[PDB]
Amino acid sequence: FGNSRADMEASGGNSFNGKGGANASNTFSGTLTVTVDQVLANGNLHVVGEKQIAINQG
Amino acid sequence: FGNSRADMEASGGNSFNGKGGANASNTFSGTLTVTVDQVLANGNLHVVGEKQIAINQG
């Protein structure tokens, strides 16, 4: 053990941090009058409708 | 392990942040008297109307 033959010192480190995420949203509010353009075999009604508003510059 | 033969140190990073959105709105308030210009086969009435106001400079 003389002459620092067995003296030793070591250190080590390892680090990892990952993360992730996502999100989506949508809202819609209004009222629209549509018209029936087809009646299906079970009585369900296909409906289509369009509202066009022009206010000033569009 | 002498002469720093195995000593090492590394670092790394990766980042990403995306986002997006949209929104639309419209309001309309008023009163208008229109005229029936057609009666459909089911009794529904096609209506058209126009109001013209001139105040000072337009």
Swiss-Prot record, chains A, B:
It is found in: Cell outer membrane; Bacterial flagellum basal body. Assembles around the rod to form the L-ring and probably protects the motor/basal body from shearing forces during rotation. The basal body constitutes a major portion of the flagellar organelle and consists of four rings (L,P,S, and M) mounted on a central rod. Belongs to the FlgH family. This is Flagellar L-ring protein. It comes from Salmonella typhimurium (strain LT2 / SGSC1412 / ATCC 700720). The lineage of its organism: Bacteria, Pseudomonadati, Pseudomonadota, Gammaproteobacteria, Enterobacterales. The gene is flgH. The chain holds residues 117 to 174 of 232 of the full protein.
